[PDB]
């Protein structure tokens with residue numbers, strides 16, 4: 001039993017809700033919140049900008065130190081950093097950005113990072129400003145993630161489309 005509430009169950013291990021991931025993280029305090037990161041951990045907009053804003057820019061400060069030490073992430077890769085006031089940990093995962101021409105097949109690799117964590121609160125990778133089809137992202141999530149994932153979808157209209165079209 002965990003504290004996630006109001007989710008629709010899609011599969012044995014994947015759950016979905018119309019929610020603001022920032023507000024969901026603030027209420028649940030999950031062990032892991034996933035950020036829709038880029039390779040530079042520049043959290044300017046989309047989910048990343050919203051998560052970072054909710055940390056009063058502490059996520060960005062920590063991220064800049066991480067990059068200065070380690071260099072950029074790989075597309076499809078991840079790193080674990082602090083969850084600040086939102087979660088114990090933040091798993092920064094880099095899905096491909098279609099608006100940069102990145103290969104969509106890397107979306108499966110990106111979701112594989114979730115399997116290193118037993119339970120996660122997450123957005124749909126490569127959705128929103130990353131330019132992928134959220135319906136495809138949900139399919140890859142379901143077919144790749146084996147651990148327990150709670151997906152927060154900000155837009156009510158998209159949420160309804162994802163549920164109604166789910167196979």
Ligand SMILES: O[C@@H]1CC[C@H](Nc2ncnc3[nH]ccc23)C1
Nearest residue numbers: 021046047050123128129152154
């Ligand atoms: O990137 C586009 C634009 C926003 C959508 N993604 C999100 N999904 C869950 N919670 C969120 N809070 C803020 C954004 C957000 C998709």
